[PDB]
Amino acid sequence: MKQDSASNATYTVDCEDYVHVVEFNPFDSGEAGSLLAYGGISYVVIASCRFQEEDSTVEGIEFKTLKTFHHGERVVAIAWSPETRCDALLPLLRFATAAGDKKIRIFTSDFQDKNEYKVIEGHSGYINDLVFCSPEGTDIASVGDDHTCRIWDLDGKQIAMFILRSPGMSVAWHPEGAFKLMVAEKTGTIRFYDLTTHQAILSLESVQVPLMSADWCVRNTLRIGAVAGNDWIIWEMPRSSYPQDNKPAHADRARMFRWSKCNENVFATTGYPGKMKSQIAIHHLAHPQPILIGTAPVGSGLSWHRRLPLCVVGGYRKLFFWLTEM
Amino acid sequence: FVNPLPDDDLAIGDEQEPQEAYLECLFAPGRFTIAALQKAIQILRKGSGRVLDLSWEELKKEV
Amino acid sequence: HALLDVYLLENADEMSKHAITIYFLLDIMYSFPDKPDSSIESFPTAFFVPGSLIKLIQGFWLLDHNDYQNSVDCILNPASSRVMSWQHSQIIENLLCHGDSRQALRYLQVMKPVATTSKEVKLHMTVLLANRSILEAWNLQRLHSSRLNV
Amino acid sequence: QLLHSQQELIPRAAQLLLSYYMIRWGSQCLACAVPVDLLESNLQHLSVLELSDSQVEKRRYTS
């Protein structure tokens, strides 16, 4: 937990379903404005959202649902490929999910009433994380509970498999990089994979365990953020095989670490979900204290706006938006 | 059957990270002694204070 | 030789043909049980069929012989690969026809069958309403009340 | 007669190998330095939930 500059959601969105997963569009949109998607237990809803931050005609927030799709077993993680289109006569959609079935499923859509599906095979132990590993995404890297990092194609074939020491909790794409991937282990091992040559380049070691959530800096490559134990840690390349900076993130078991998609010094963290009406802690660098605290009755999902310093956290049938600094 | 000393020098190819593998070799069970590890740290640091009496986490962190 | 020629057919799954052969071998065993142990029981390990599928085949045998209780026990046994939606539907419909509402409800609650079709929803709400789960039935009705299915 | 007995003895040796792999893996598994306070808190919670009964002679954590 963290409590500093606690406030209500700058924007609050009322939905017809509890929020299981929810997150923005990272980059590469066919048109202006942020698409966002939330999947619950049997439905996934994509909706375009406009803020008074961006648009003056849009007052507060104008959220308009593009689609609600009937899916099966509850979606537990969603993979965006930064190649989707919103312009012209055909909006491209190629998005993946991992559900309460341990399996991965790929969905392609065009708004023209064509949507077919590719279910991607699993492995030993549940899919812990999955991200498209191209700057537009065509291939997905997944980490699971077999200490294997398995790269798959759109067809469902093993692009690659890397043998890890412990089951990987998180896999991360480098939008600033090119086939630069991170794989995070519970023991505290961070591995950088050059998927262009399948040669592992650099490693990081965390002194706080277990390690489950991390991220690159969005506006910098030397800065690597993560949450371990109960504190948030930043490593500075190439001078660390140990925490460069480590400051408390959440007294309870902090779960998610995210970096601002327009800031190289502002990041967001979530508390341990639910329970104490979990708080989003928006931190600025060189501040153990969070520069912002927001309250969501359950901690479910954490996203950063494509170019706004806007952080969204889901909760019980609701979405909560907080704006932060550069 | 008595063990004279642990296995000697190893060569690791470039299909993996040598750092993690050598950490595993250094901390492998039944090999070396902890006092050997502190003495090695002290000598490679060109002389330093005693680094004995370390927990597992702090010992690996200091290494 | 007709069973053998099944292998010569287009194999969609070696596990399917293995399960067919294992079911036939179990039928042989129950036709005349002789001796308390057999190397024929070693066939699934010989052809490397998962114990999940083995317990499944046991459940299929029991359900065919209308030992619904034991079939449900074997199916609900954990570490079992999840069965397919069509046989979910047929199993639950047969159970309701036979009047095993409690057994069908136990099946649904443990296995958590999928439902994304109006027919699936109707079947699941039928089981729930026969078993007096009116609240969850209404809730899922409200959830999936599309403009087409409401 | 030999092969049929081999078919029967294969799964049993497989499960024996599974158990011995379990024990070898455990012997290879490292363990972290955990406070005895948390150790005894877990002991109390387990005793409350009725999976264990408290028994203490001498608990050590290696250095």
Q: What is the C-alpha to C-alpha distance for residues A228 and A170, in angstroms, rounded to an integer? A: 12
Q: What is the C-alpha to C-alpha distance for residues A142 and A186, in angstroms, rounded to an integer? A: 15
Q: Are A296 and A313 in contact (CB under 8 A)?
A: yes
Q: What is the C-alpha to C-alpha distance for residues A293 and A282, in angstroms, rounded to an integer? A: 6
Instruction: Inform me whether the C-beta atom of residue B20 falls under 8 Å from chain A C-beta atoms.
Output: yes
- Whether B57 sits inside 8 A of D33 (CB atoms) is yes
Across-strand partners of A151? A141, A160
Chains contacting A with at least 3 CB pairs below 8 Å? Answer: B, C
Which of A15, A17, A20, A42 best tests the C interface by mutation, with the highest count of C CBs <10 A?
A42
Q: What is the C-alpha to C-alpha distance for residues A151 and A160, in angstroms, rounded to an integer? A: 5
Q: Which of A189, A207, A209 sits opposite B20 (nearest CB)?
A: A189
Q: Are A107 and A93 in contact (CB under 8 A)?
A: yes
Instruction: Inform me whether the C-beta atom of residue B16 falls under 8 Å from chain A C-beta atoms.
Output: yes
Strand order, beta sheet including A93-99: A75-79, A93-99, A104-109, A115-120
Instruction: Inform me whether the C-beta atom of residue B24 falls under 8 Å from chain D C-beta atoms.
Output: no
Residue A22 neighbours by CB under 8 Å, 6+ apart: A36, A37, A38, A39, A300, A301, A303, A312, A314, A319
Residues of chain A with C-beta less than 8 angstroms from the C-beta of C149:
none
Instruction: Inform me whether the C-beta atom of residue B32 falls under 8 Å from chain D C-beta atoms.
Output: no
Q: What is the C-alpha to C-alpha distance for residues C38 and C22, in angstroms, rounded to an integer? A: 13
How far CA A90 is from CA of A228, A288, C2, in Å, comes to: 43, 46, 52
DSSP A130-146: EEE-SSS-SSEEEEETT
- Whether B34 sits inside 8 A of D63 (CB atoms) is yes
| The pairing of beta strand A6-7 with beta strand A292-295 | parallel
Residue A56 neighbours by CB under 8 Å, 6+ apart: none
Chains contacting D with at least 3 CB pairs below 8 Å? Answer: B, C
| The pairing of beta strand A61-70 with beta strand A75-79 | unpaired
Residue whose tokens read 């890297």: A141
Which residue numbers of C have CB closer than 8 Å to D's CBs?
37, 39, 41-43, 45-46
Residues of chain C with C-beta less than 8 angstroms from the C-beta of D8:
37, 39, 41-42
Instruction: Inform me whether the C-beta atom of residue A186 falls under 8 Å from chain B C-beta atoms.
Output: no
Residues of chain B with C-beta less than 8 angstroms from the C-beta of A207:
57, 61
Conformational region of residue A179, where left means phi above 0, alpha means psi within -120 to 50, and beta covers everything else: left
Which of C120, C143, C147 best tests the A interface by mutation, with the highest count of A CBs <10 A?
C143
Residue A32 neighbours by CB under 8 Å, 6+ apart: A54
Residue whose tokens read 């702090």: B58
Which contacts qualify for A145-148: CB closer than 8 Å, 24 or more apart? A147/A185, A148/A123, A148/A124
Resolution limit in angstroms?
8.1
Which contacts qualify for C66-75: CB closer than 8 Å, 24 or more apart? C66/C98, C68/C95, C68/C98, C68/C100, C68/C103, C69/C103, C72/C103, C72/C106, C72/C107, C75/C107, C75/C111
Residues 86-105 in A contacting C (C-alpha not used; CB under 8 Å): 101
Tokens of C76: 């609900």
Residue A161 neighbours by CB under 8 Å, 6+ apart: A148, A149, A150, A151
- The dihedral of CA C64, C68, C74, C80: what is its sign? positive
Experimental technique used to determine this entry: cryo-EM
How wide is the angle at C-alpha A97 spanned by C-alphas A267 and A197, nearest 5°?
A: 75
How far CA C33 is from CA of C25, C28, C70, C109, D26, in Å, comes to: 12, 8, 20, 36, 42
Instruction: Determine the residue type at C138.
Output: W
Tokens of C119: 């027919």
- Whether A42 sits inside 8 A of C115 (CB atoms) is yes
Residue A199 neighbours by CB under 8 Å, 6+ apart: A193
Instruction: Determine the residue type at C36.
Output: P
Q: Are A127 and A148 in contact (CB under 8 A)?
A: no
Helices then strands, each counted (H, E), chain C? 9, 0
Q: D43 in helix, strand or coil?
A: helix
Q: What is the C-alpha to C-alpha distance for residues A49 and A312, in angstroms, rounded to an integer? A: 12
Instruction: Inform me whether the C-beta atom of residue B29 falls under 8 Å from chain D C-beta atoms.
Output: yes
Q: Do chains D and C touch (3 or more CB pairs under 8 A)?
A: yes
